[PDB]
Amino acid sequence: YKNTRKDPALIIWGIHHSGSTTEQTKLYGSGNKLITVGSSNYQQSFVPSPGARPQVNGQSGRIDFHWLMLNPNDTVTFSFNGAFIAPDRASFLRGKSMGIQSSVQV
Amino acid sequence: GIDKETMGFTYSGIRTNGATSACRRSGSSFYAEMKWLLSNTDNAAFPQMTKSYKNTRKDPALIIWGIHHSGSTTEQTKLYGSGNKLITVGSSNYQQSFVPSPGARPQVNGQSGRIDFHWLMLNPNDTVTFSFNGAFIAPDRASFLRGKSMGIQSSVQV
Amino acid sequence: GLFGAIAGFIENGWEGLIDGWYGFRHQNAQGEGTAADYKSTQSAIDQITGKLNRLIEKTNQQFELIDNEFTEVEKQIGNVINWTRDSMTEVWSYNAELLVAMENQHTIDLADSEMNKLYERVKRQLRENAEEDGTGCFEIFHKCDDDCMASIRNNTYDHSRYREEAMQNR
Amino acid sequence: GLFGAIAGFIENGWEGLIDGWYGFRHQNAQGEGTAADYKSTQSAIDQITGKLNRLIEKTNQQFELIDNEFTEVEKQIGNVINWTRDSMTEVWSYNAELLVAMENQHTIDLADSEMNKLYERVKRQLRENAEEDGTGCFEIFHKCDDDCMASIRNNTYDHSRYREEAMQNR
Amino acid sequence: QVQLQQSGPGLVKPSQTLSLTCAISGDSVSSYNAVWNWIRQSPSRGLEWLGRTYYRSGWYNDYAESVKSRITINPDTSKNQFSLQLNSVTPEDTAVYYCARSGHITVFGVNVDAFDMWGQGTMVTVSSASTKGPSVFPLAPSGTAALGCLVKDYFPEPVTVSWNSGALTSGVHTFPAVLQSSGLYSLSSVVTVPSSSLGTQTYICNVNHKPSNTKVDKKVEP
Ligand SMILES: *[C@@H]1O[C@H](CO)[C@@H](O[C@@H]2O[C@H](CO)[C@@H](O[C@@H]3O[C@H](CO)[C@@H](O)[C@H](O[C@H]4O[C@H](CO)[C@@H](O)[C@H](O)[C@@H]4O)[C@@H]3O)[C@H](O)[C@H]2NC(C)=O)[C@H](O)[C@H]1NC(C)=O
Ligand SMILES: *[C@@H]1O[C@H](CO)[C@@H](O[C@@H]2O[C@H](CO)[C@@H](O)[C@H](O)[C@H]2NC(C)=O)[C@H](O)[C@H]1NC(C)=O
Ligand SMILES: *[C@@H]1O[C@H](CO)[C@@H](O[C@@H]2O[C@H](CO)[C@@H](O)[C@H](O)[C@H]2NC(C)=O)[C@H](O)[C@H]1NC(C)=O
Ligand SMILES: *[C@@H]1O[C@H](CO)[C@@H](O)[C@H](O)[C@H]1NC(C)=O
Ligand SMILES: *[C@@H]1O[C@H](CO)[C@@H](O)[C@H](O)[C@H]1NC(C)=O
């Protein structure tokens, strides 16, 4: 994916860690999986590690989400061979705001 | 300060008494709060193991473990059997893995191997699971914090 | 007060003086009367108002969140943040305390100054026609009717008009 | 001014007084003349000079770069740095504003003080030989020639020499 | 919700005493944070302060130099009111008299004589003329209709007029009184209504002349 816009794009992806090795094979086939991700600015890799985690929302598997800012007219390449949660959309920032943490009504 | 409580881990099919001349108590010994898990005999395959501990107390538990990096690949096989080893550790809050890398480091306290120690805070009524297949220094006890203090660095007498 | 007029040689304030900060109270054949002096009162008011204009204002600098109340940041960076924030809290608490103490000292001395200035202005007006009592009163030797008292307050008083009578009365 | 001499009972300053801060202007048979007083002028100058010696100086502390203008640091640490720097900017801007305001108040009151001190010094010199006008002038009852005026300025003036003539002129 | 309510006769004979009362609600006549004033207004003299009273750990009074020899303003702490007493009145004392609170509103605790609340006013006429009642005549309506009431030959001012005991206000105009050559006042009050409502709606003007204790109602019909 090339960012053809004048501002940086926020790109997300996920690595799925199944609750067991057998689940990993069922979903993506056997073998030691790999995901690489690179831009002109960024350089990083991911190999999944399946295994039993305690159940959260009824699930013993986990997804590692990752992010990068893709510069104007730079390209991100996803080379993967399983256990990859692919982005459907890129995010762009609209302008300026302020974020707060609150427990009371607007 | 710290209050200590047993992790409640028991073991079968492996040795639990790894010791070294680097940790002496009138003879070879080891970290008092940890256990050096070895294959039952030399060059034997360490079995694929899982061990679980739930924090049943109202404050977070400090959990420690260690990954052993032998001074050579042959030493790694002698202690834990051949093959590419793995240790995973997860809680509801924490998510991380470890594969050992043996190799010659310069001798410190007469040893060319190393232990990577790691830690996490285990929340009240959360569970930590250790899935390992060798090169793992297991905790014997969890630590709990007693209350409040101040720590200083000093070179003079009390 | 630094000058020694308010809570000084002037024994005490007047609760009846509701229209001004500083004023005159006279005694003559016609009786007694009290009147506020607005020029001195306004000078004091304008100066206090100036301090408030300075202190009640914008710090335009806007600060964003740098930590998280719901999901705590890493402990090392979190401790650096807290140490820095607590250091700033210490600086500002110290600054605020010293500012208010300094301004209050000056405000009290300022009011005391304006009272003294009014007293000395009157003393100069009726030179050789009256004498300082020591309670912030001027004992006037010649007869001074309400029009004469009002001339002192007004600042039109002409001492040469009554000097022969007043001087000879010593 | 706190004392009420400058911009007070002294109506206004003299543009012609170019050689000094404070001075004397006289009227006598021989005419009019103006002269600056250096002792009072120097005291004021020395004190202002002292403030400048204090304020124009070294902060020996040297600060290195902790971020990077060409290749931006990590966003979390970068935000902590910026927050800390902006907090320091806020403290120093506040400090500078308050310093200058405080020093300026004192500088104005200081000049007003020196003017008052000179006036009172003269008043004491010619006790019972003259009377306060109220414009910062002393009406002198005896004849006072240029040598007599210069004796007042010089501070050698001897009131007992002219007291019989001056006192009897009341 | 401070409220100043004024009472007292609006007719005083020359050389006699004008006496008015202001009754306070929502605040205390002896409050540290109030000053109680009287002010009068005439088309000639304009607005003129008369005097005041206030409590600051003892009662104080100040009066305008123009009335100082004739005037007394006293607090009543039993009824929470204060009065105005003006002796030896002359035609030059004919005016509207207002009570007013000041010194509630201050610059750094200094009463700056801001009059933040006023009474409704009492119109006072100095005259030796006996009061007279006002005759009230209908101004009959002959798709908008106008009807009214002529309020004729009364003294002194004022007269108040309402319609249907205050239930009708829209389209009402009550004209300022005119002094006739007889030395008596007259005015009219008029209202425009839908001409259709004439056959169903009753229209009554309610006329009040407090100086003569006159309250009169008059039905106005086609
Ligand atoms: C030192 O000087 C200051 C002024 O710089 C002075 O402060 C003033 O205090 C009064 C209260 O006593 C404030 O007045 C309020 O104004 C608001 C509208 O702005 C009103 O809504 C308030 O009304 C209340 O009380 C009424 C009855 O009295 C009720 O009817 C109503 O429901 C409310 O309860 C009230 O009038 C005034 O705003 C300040 N001034 C400023 C600038 O803030 C202060 O009192 C002085 N100190 C001393 C000890 O005198
Ligand atoms: C930084 O300070 C905050 C408070 O200013 C600490 O968070 C609080 O911790 C107490 C008990 O230790 C909790 O009960 C509160 O819920 C916390 N308050 C907030 C506002 O978060 C925080 O622990 C400090 N950071 C570190 C790293 O210790
Ligand atoms: C910390 O502050 C600096 C500026 O003081 C920020 O860098 C600037 O960002 C603007 C637009 O956001 C750029 O146009 C400038 O080139 C930058 N100036 C400099 C001097 O670098 C920086 O973004 C801030 N740090 C973070 C993490 O947001
Ligand atoms: C000052 O007050 C007096 C009252 O005695 C008045 O007659 C006089 O005109 C006033 N001065 C001026 C300049 O108006
Ligand atoms: C002061 O000035 C006068 C000029 O009148 C001069 O004669 C006198 O000597 C001076 N005083 C001293 C101490 O020199």
DSSP secondary structure string, C94-148? HHHHHHHHHHHHHHHHHHHHHHHHHHHHHHHHTTTTEEE-SSS-EEESS---HHH
Q: Which residues pair with A19 in a beta bridge?
A: none
CATH 2.60.40.10 residue spans of chain E: 1-128, 129-221
Closest residue in A to C70 (Cα–Cα): A101
- Alpha-carbon distance C140 to C126, whole Å? 8
User: C61 and D101: CB-CB below 8 Å?
Assistant: no
Local structure of residue D40 (DSSP, 8 states): H
Cα gap C104→B149, rounded to integer Å: 41
Cα dihedral sign, D51-D57-D61-D67: positive
Q: What is the SS3 assignment for A104?
A: coil
CA nearest E134: which of E148, E152, E118, E114?
A: E152
Structural domains of chain C ordered from first start: 1-170 (3.90.20.10)
Structure tokens at A21: 């090795």
Q: Is C115 on the interface with D (CB under 8 A)?
A: no
CA distance E81 to E29: 6
- Looking at the complex, report in whole angstroms how far the Cα of residue A73 sits from the nearest Cα belonging to chain C: 30
| Contact indicator for B152, B108 with CB cutoff of 8 Å | no
Tell me how many domains chain B contains. 1
Ligand nearest to the CA of D146: 5
Closest CA to D67 of D75, D78, D83, D59: D78
Residue pair C26/C149 in contact (Cβ under 8 Å)? The answer is: yes
Domain with B66 in it: 1-156
Tell me phi and psi for residue E174, to 5 degrees: -105, 115
Helix axes C75-125, C38-55, angle to 10 degrees: 170
Q: Which secondary structure element, helix H or strand E, spans residue E42, and what is its range?
A: strand E35-42
Q: How was this structure determined?
A: X-ray
Superfamily (CATH) of domain E129-221: Immunoglobulins (2.60.40.10)
Angle at C77 (CA atoms; ends A95, D90), nearest 5 degrees: 60
Helix (H) or strand (E) holding E22: strand E18-25
Three-class HEC string of A2-56: ECCCCCCEEEEEEEEECCCHHHHHHHHCCCCCCEEEECCCCEEEECCCCCCCCCE
Interchain contact, E111 vs C15, CB within 8 Å: no
User: Which residue, B24, B54, B32, B15, is CA-closest to B136?
Assistant: B15
| Alpha carbon distances (Å) from C32 to C26, C27, C146, C149, C160 | 6, 5, 9, 11, 25
How many residues belong to chain C?
170
The 8-class DSSP code of residue B45 comes to: P
Burial E176-193 (b: 16+ CB within 10 A, else e): ebeeeeeebbbbbbbbeb
Comparing CB atoms, the residue among A52, A54, A64 nearest residue B92 is A54
CATH number for the domain that contains residue B80: 3.90.209.20
Measure B19 CA to nearest chain A CA, in Å: 30
Residue D48 and residue D53: Cα distance in Å, rounded? 9
Radius of gyration, CA atoms only, chain E = 21
Give me ligand 5 centre to Cα D156, in Å: 7
SS3 of residue D84 by DSSP:
helix
Distance CA D97, CA D89 (A): 12
User: What single-letter DSSP state applies at residue D162?
Assistant: H
E31 interface with C at CB cutoff 8 Å: no
Check if D68 has its Cβ closer than 6 Å to any atom of ligand 5.
Answer: no
What token pair was written down for A53? 């985690």
Question: How many angstroms separate the CA atoms of B66 and B46, rounded?
Answer: 16
As a whole number of angstroms, the distance between CA C150 and CA C132 comes to 19
Compute φ and ψ for E52, nearest 5 degrees.
-160, 165
Cα→Cα distances D134→C44, D150, E112, Å: 22, 22, 30
When CB atoms are compared, the residue of C62, C65, C70 closest to A99 is C65
Residue C152 near residue C37, CB atoms below 8 Å = no
B26/B34 Cα distance (integer angstroms): 18
Q: Residue C82: which of B93, D93, D84 has the closest Cα?
A: D84
- Sign of torsion over alpha carbons B74, B79, B80, B84: negative
Q: Is the N-terminal amide bond of E156 cis, ω within 30° of 0?
A: yes
Q: What is the resolution of this structure in A?
A: 3.8
Strands A9-17 and A62-70, bridge-based pairing:
antiparallel
Residue C41, burial from CB neighbour count under 10 angstroms (0-12, 13-18, 19+): buried
DSSP-assigned states of every residue in D86-146: HHHHHHHHHHHHHHHHHHHHHHHHHHHHHHHHHHHHHHHHTTTTEEE-SSS-EEESS---H
Which of C15, C36, C137 has the alpha carbon at shortest distance from E60? Answer: C15
d(CA E61, CA E51) in angstroms, rounded, equals 7
- B93 interfaces chain A, CB cutoff of 8 Å: no
CB B126 to CB A62 under 8 A?
Answer: no
Q: Do A54 and B97 touch (CB under 8 A)?
A: no
Which residue has the least CA distance to atom 5 on ligand 4?
C147
Which positions in chain C touch D134 (Cβ < 8 Å)? 121, 124-125, 127
E53/E77 Cα distance (integer angstroms): 12
**Measured distance CA(A86)–CA(A1) in Å, rounded:** 12
Could you tell me which residues are beta bridge partners of residue E193? E145
Whole-angstrom distance, CA of residue D99 vs CA of residue D55: 10
- Ligand 2 midpoint to CA C72 (Å): 8
Residue C35 Cβ < 6 Å to ligand 4: no
Q: What radius of gyration, in Å, describes the C-alpha atoms of chain C?
A: 27
Neighbours of A54 (CB within 10 A): 15
Residues C161, C140: Cα–Cα separation, whole Å = 14
The phi, psi pair for E165, rounded to 5°, reads 50, 40
CA angle at B97 for the pair B93 and B99, rounded to the nearest 5°: 165
- How far does CA C12 lie from the centroid of its chain? 15
Mutate to test the interface with C, among D92, D98, D108, D138 (most CBs of C within 10 A): D98
Which of E32, E61, E108 has the most C C-beta neighbours within 10 Å, making it the best mutation to test the interface with C?
Answer: E108
On the question of a cis peptide bond just before residue E91, with omega within 30 degrees of 0, the verdict is no
Pocket test for ligand 3, best of D70, D82, D85, D87 (most atoms within 8 A of CB): D82
Which chains have 3 or more CB–CB distances shorter than 8 Å to chain C? Answer: A, D, E
3-state secondary structure of E130: coil
Amino acid at B157: Q
Partnered with residue B67 across adjacent β-strands are B116, B136
Instruction: Classify residue B47 by its DSSP letter.
Output: P
Residue with tokens 């940041």: C73
Taking CA C153 as the corner, what is the angle to CA C147 and CA C158, rounded to the nearest 5 degrees? 65
How far is the C-alpha of E1 from the C-alpha of A77, rounded, in Å?
73
Nearest chain A Cα distance for residue B85, angstroms: 13
Task: For chain B, say whether A47 makes contact (Cβ under 8 Å).
Answer: no
Q: How many CB pairs under 8 A join A and B?
A: 27
Taking the centre of ligand 3 as the mean of its atom positions, its distance from the CA of residue D84, in whole angstroms, is 14
Q: What share of chain B is helix, strand, coil (3-state, %, to 5)?
A: 5, 45, 50
Question: Is E153 within 8 Å of E184 (Cβ atoms)?
Answer: yes
Selecting from 3.40.50.300, 3.30.429.10, 3.10.150.10, 2.60.40.10, what CATH number does the domain E1-128 have? 2.60.40.10
Q: What would the two tokens of residue D142 be?
A: 């005896």
Contact A66, A9 (CB under 8 A): no
Buried/exposed A6-31: b ≥16 CB within 10 Å, e otherwise: eebbebebbbbbbbeeeebeeebeee
Name the β-bridge partners of E36: E53, E101
Contacts of residue D93, Cβ cutoff 8 Å, sequence gap at least 6: none
How many Cβ atoms are within 10 Å of A100's Cβ, its own excluded?
7
Residue pairs between chains A and C whose CB atoms are closer than 8 Å: 9
Q: Is the CB of C78 under 6 A from ligand 2?
A: yes
Q: A104 CB near a chain C CB, below 8 Å?
A: no
In this structure, the residues whose C-beta lies within 6 A of any atom of ligand 3 are: D 69, 75, 78-79, 82
Residue of minimum CA distance from atom 14 in ligand 3? D69
The shortest C-alpha distance from B129 to chain A (Å) reads 7
**Ligand 2 site, residue C79, Cβ cutoff 6 A:** yes
Cα of C86 vs centre of ligand 2, distance in Å, is 12
